[PDB]
Design a protein around this ligand. Sequence first.
Ligand SMILES: Cc1c[nH]c2ncc(C(=O)N(C)c3nnn[nH]3)cc12
Length: 167
Amino acid sequence: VNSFSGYLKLTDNVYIKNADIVEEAKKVKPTVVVNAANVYLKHGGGVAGALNKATNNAMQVESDDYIATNGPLKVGGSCVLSGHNLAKHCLHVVGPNVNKGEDIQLLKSAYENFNQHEVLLAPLLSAGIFGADPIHSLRVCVDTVRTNVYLAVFDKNLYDKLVSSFL
Ligand SMILES: Cc1c[nH]c2ncc(C(=O)N(C)c3nnn[nH]3)cc12
């Protein structure tokens, strides 16, 4: 039993809700919140901009130190950093950015990072300003992640389309 509430069950291990991941994180305090990161950990907009703003920019400060030490992530890769006031940990995961021409096949590799964590609160990777089809992202999620994933979808209209079209 865990503290996630109001989710629709899609599969054995994947759950979905129309929610603001920032507000969902502040209420649940999950062990892991997933950020929709880029390779530079520049959290300017989309989910990343929202998560960083909710940490009063502490996420960005920590991220800049990480990059100065380690260099950029790979597309499809991840790193674990602090969850600040939102979660114990933040798993920064880089999905392909279609608006940068990145290979959408890398979306599966991105979701594989979730399997290193037993339970996660997450957005749909590569959705939103990353330019992929969220229906596709949900399908890859279900077909790749084996650990327990609680997906937050900010847009109600998209949420109902995702539920109604789910196979
Ligand atoms: C910008 C932002 C703040 N909070 C958020 N929470 C979730 C998502 C999201 O992951 N998806 C799939 C989504 N919702 N509406 N359109 N896309 C995006 C945000």
